[PDB]
Amino acid sequence: MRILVTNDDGIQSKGIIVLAELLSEEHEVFVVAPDKERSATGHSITIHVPLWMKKVFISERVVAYSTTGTPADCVKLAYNVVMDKRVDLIVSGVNRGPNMGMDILHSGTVSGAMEGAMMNIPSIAISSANYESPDFEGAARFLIDFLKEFDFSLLDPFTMLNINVPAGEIKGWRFTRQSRRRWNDYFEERVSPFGEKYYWMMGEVIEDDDRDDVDYKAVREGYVSITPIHPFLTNEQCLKKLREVYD
Amino acid sequence: MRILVTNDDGIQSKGIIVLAELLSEEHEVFVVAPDKERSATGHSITIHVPLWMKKVFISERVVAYSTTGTPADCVKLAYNVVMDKRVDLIVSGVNRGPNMGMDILHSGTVSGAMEGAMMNIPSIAISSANYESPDFEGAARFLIDFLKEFDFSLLDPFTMLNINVPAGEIKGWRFTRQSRRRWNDYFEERVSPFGEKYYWMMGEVIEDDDRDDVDYKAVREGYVSITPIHPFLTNEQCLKKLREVYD
Ligand SMILES: [Mg+2]
Ligand SMILES: [Mg+2]
Numbered sequence: 001m002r003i004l005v006t007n008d009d010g011i012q013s014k015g016i017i018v019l020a021e022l023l024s025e026e027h028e029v030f031v032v033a034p035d036k037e038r039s040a041t042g043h044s045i046t047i048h049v050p051l052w053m054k055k056v057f058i059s060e061r062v063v064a065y066s067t068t069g070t071p072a073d074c075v076k077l078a079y080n081v082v083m084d085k086r087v088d089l090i091v092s093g094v095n096r097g098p099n100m101g102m103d104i105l106h107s108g109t110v111s112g113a114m115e116g117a118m119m120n121i122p123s124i125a126i127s128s129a130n131y132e133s134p135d136f137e138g139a140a141r142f143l144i145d146f147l148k149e150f151d152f153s154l155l156d157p158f159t160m161l162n163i164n165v166p167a168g169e170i171k172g173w174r175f176t177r178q179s180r181r182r183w184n185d186y187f188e189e190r191v192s193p194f195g196e197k198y199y200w201m202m203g204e205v206i207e208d209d210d211r212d213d214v215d216y217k218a219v220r221e222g223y224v225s226i227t228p229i230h231p232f233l234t235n236e237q238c239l240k241k242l243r244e245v246y247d
Numbered sequence: 248m249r250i251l252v253t254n255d256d257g258i259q260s261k262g263i264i265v266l267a268e269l270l271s272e273e274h275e276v277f278v279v280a281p282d283k284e285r286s287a288t289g290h291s292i293t294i295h296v297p298l299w300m301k302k303v304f305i306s307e308r309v310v311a312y313s314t315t316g317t318p319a320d321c322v323k324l325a326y327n328v329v330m331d332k333r334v335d336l337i338v339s340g341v342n343r344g345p346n347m348g349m350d351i352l353h354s355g356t357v358s359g360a361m362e363g364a365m366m367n368i369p370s371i372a373i374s375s376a377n378y379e380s381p382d383f384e385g386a387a388r389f390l391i392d393f394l395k396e397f398d399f400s401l402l403d404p405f406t407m408l409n410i411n412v413p414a415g416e417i418k419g420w421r422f423t424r425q426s427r428r429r430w431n432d433y434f435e436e437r438v439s440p441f442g443e444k445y446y447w448m449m450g451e452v453i454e455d456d457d458r459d460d461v462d463y464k465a466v467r468e469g470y471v472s473i474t475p476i477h478p479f480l481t482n483e484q485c486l487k488k489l490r491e492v493y494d
Binding site: 120153154157 | 332
């Protein structure tokens with residue numbers, strides 16, 4: 001099948017290269033990713049200025065291009081300009097560091113796969129859960145095995161899979177729900193050479209979920225976390241309550 | 248609701264047209280059916296040669312395509328290329344004639360709905376239990392009412408419903424088990440103009456099930472037969488015996 005690979009750490013990232021190589025063993029792989037590493041860009045897209053692409057190679061069996069856009073921009077370009085609107089699977093990763101809880105909202109890795117989900121194409125976001133010491137190969141190999149055991153018809157429309165792989169040894173895998181893991185921000189103030197102060201964003205993690213089947217608890221125990229997510233943010237319970245009171 | 252409608256009698260059958268027109272009154276209907284008779288094709292699929300489709304609108308609220316494939320091919324084509332993997336319900340019928348007992352093994356109607364079950368999509372096979380004098384409208388009317396009261400969450404994975412509606416009065420509905428109804432086969436021999444003999448398959452029905460809750464008994468009493476079936480044929484009882492003996 002025709003597979004599209006992208007990421008948010010840049011086309012030269014080892015995380016995207018190993019992933020492309022392994023997948024190219026049995027499928028037609030196309031790589032379209034940012035020319036340079038992106039930060040917490042969330043689901044940003046480029047509409048106010050033009051986008052540019054550059055054909056670069058990584059090896060045979062794989063056609064690759066780097067772009068001046070975001071991960072979502074990359075998926076839009078690959079689908080319309082490079083793959084003739086014929087894409088069977090989209091994989092965004094392997095990211096350096098975890099993408100769990102509310103942090104998924106500002107994740108470029110997740111954004112790439114979510115763009116695929118909005119187009120109704122089977123998509124997967126995969127991250128190695130250790131920023132300091134990532135294991136790109138381990139995450140990529142897990143993915144190859146998982147694909148042979150997963151029934152994609154079970155993935156509902158506009159739905160993608162957010163996967164986080166433990167950096168150490170993998171005990172197994174679990175289907176999880178997104179946690180409420182978030183951060184308690186704060187800033188450190190400093191002064192520039194001009195006497196003007198600037199601020200550095202900092203923070204401490206908050207893990208207070210009471211449910212046992214959330215993403216970070218699985219990873220903490222050495223299990224791969226697999227969460228099905230979609231682009232629908234309506235709080236149904238709240239909506240029902242509002243309608244009952246204001247009927 | 249996005250409903251996929253197919254059949255095994257052919258895209259121009261009165262049974263599929265009646266069903267499609269009535270469902271389109273409240274739902275978004277997509278019809279993908281064979282371009283010819285395929286009643287006794289069973290669960291055959293096309294993998295050695297290409298498949299083709301032809302748009303053949305039937306109305307405004309309904310999009311229709313005929314195909315050179317089998318009923319099962321129709322469902323695969325509908326889900327993957329016509330409906331963009333967005334299917335809420337699959338209905339195969341209304342077939343002209345009954346589909347009960349062992350006859351479901353060679354039924355194109357049941358095969359199409361089974362393709363749905365294999366993808367864990369709510370699916371229904373519906374037939375008007377009288378080949379010579381069917382009541383397509385009646386069967387359709389019944390389904391429409393059934394869809395408004397049945398709770399599909401009750402269906403187990405890989406499970407579909409095989410429904411047979413009496414052609415006369417419908418006294419009500421009953422959840423049944425598949426019967427062992429089959430036929431006493433035999434061939435009539437004839438000779439061609441060139442001296443070569445050919446054979447015509449013929450038969451007489453065998454109704455010898457001693458259980459009272461089987462499909463054909465319900466239909467004979469004037470009640471709709473609703474049987475939950477799945478793609479598993481292992482004879483558990485026999486398997487346990489063979490092991491307890493050998494091993
Ligand atoms: Mg990154
Ligand atoms: Mg038929």
